[PDB]
Amino acid sequence: GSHMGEEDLCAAFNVICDNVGKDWRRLARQLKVSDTKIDSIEDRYPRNLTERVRESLRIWKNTEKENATVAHLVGALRSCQMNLVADLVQEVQQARDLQNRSGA
């Protein structure tokens, strides 16, 4: 199994934290977050999404773990109506498709 893990994934988790602003509550829902949590996470940080986000991530991947690959991050981001974001992470998934460069 690879050793380092804060690589390409950095753009997938740093993205969720880069734009934020109702950006996480979108991936959070899609990642399988219930309303009892968004309401909780939101309370834990009423004026700090950058922190509440890191909270789902602990759960977010807890469910799609095996399906929480880089593609899951960007692929999921798109469902959050956040293409501009998903687009920069799309580069994340391109980190390897860039060798031959062949996306959509």
SSE run: HHHHHH
Which CATH architecture would you pick?
Orthogonal Bundle
The domain tally reads 1
CATH class: Mainly Alpha
- Fourth CATH level, the homologous superfamily: Death Domain, Fas
Instruction: From the alpha carbons, calculate the radius of gyration and give it in angstroms.
Output: 14 Å
PDB class: apoptosis
Keywords: apoptosis, death domain, adapter molecule, FAS receptor death inducing signalling complex
Assembly: monomeric
Entry title: Death domain from human FADD/MORT1
Molecular structure report:
By secondary structure, the protein is mainly α. It has one domain: Death Domain, Fas (Orthogonal Bundle), CATH 1.10.533. 67% of the residues lie in helices and 0% in strands. It contains 6 helices and no strands. α1 packs across α4 (49-64) and α5 runs antiparallel to α6. The protein is globular, with a radius of gyration of 14 Å.
Write a concise keyword list for the protein shown above.
6 helices, FAS-associated death domain protein, apoptosis, mainly alpha, death domain, 104 residues, Death Domain, Fas
How does the SSE layout of this entry go?
Elements: H1 9-18, H2 24-32, H3 35-44, H4 49-64, H5 70-79, H6 83-97
Helix pairs in contact: 1-4, 1-5, 1-6, 2-4, 2-5, 5-6
Outline of this structure?
With 104 residues, the chain is an all-alpha fold. It has one domain (1-104): Death Domain, Fas, CATH 1.10.533. 67% of the residues lie in helices and 0% in strands.
